[PDB]
Curated annotation (Swiss-Prot):
Protein name, as recorded: Signal recognition particle 54 kDa protein
Annotated S-S bridges: none
Task of the protein: Involved in targeting and insertion of nascent membrane proteins into the cytoplasmic membrane. Binds to the hydrophobic signal sequence of the ribosome-nascent chain (RNC) as it emerges from the ribosomes. The SRP-RNC complex is then targeted to the cytoplasmic membrane where it interacts with the SRP receptor FtsY.
Residues of the full protein shown: 313 to 425 of 433
Location within or outside the cell: Cytoplasm
Family: Belongs to the GTP-binding SRP family. SRP54 subfamily.
Subunit relationships: Part of the signal recognition particle protein translocation system, which is composed of SRP and FtsY. Archaeal SRP consists of a 7S RNA molecule of 300 nucleotides and two protein subunits: SRP54 and SRP19.
Source organism of this protein record: Archaeoglobus fulgidus (strain ATCC 49558 / DSM 4304 / JCM 9628 / NBRC 100126 / VC-16)
Encoding gene per record: srp54
Domain remark from Swiss-Prot or TrEMBL: Composed of three domains: the N-terminal N domain, which is responsible for interactions with the ribosome, the central G domain, which binds GTP, and the C-terminal M domain, which binds the RNA and the signal sequence of the RNC.
Superkingdom, taxonomy of origin: Archaea
Amino acid sequence: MEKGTFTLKDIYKQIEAMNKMGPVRKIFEMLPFGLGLKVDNDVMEMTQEKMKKFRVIMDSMTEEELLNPKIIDSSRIRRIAIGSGTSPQEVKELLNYYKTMKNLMKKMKKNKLPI
């Protein structure tokens, strides 16, 4: 139905906690010219914190889409991944995360007693 018990749009907002977005003035305070294995970030994009790219796709995908995950449109997510900069594969695992939810079935409290 229109409601899917706490849709996933409620999950992406929880990651907003981290972002560090606000380059006002003096982003860094002086730096050593002899950097080592600290990061060495280069022109090639790199990945690390999964939560960092989690929020980005939150404003990409359509809320209507979040309400109905079963509507996985391979074409719609294609363009969307480009907007987020990641890819459909990273969104496929994201849904696969709720697969883990099936693991909940190991506990499946429910009731198991209609009468």
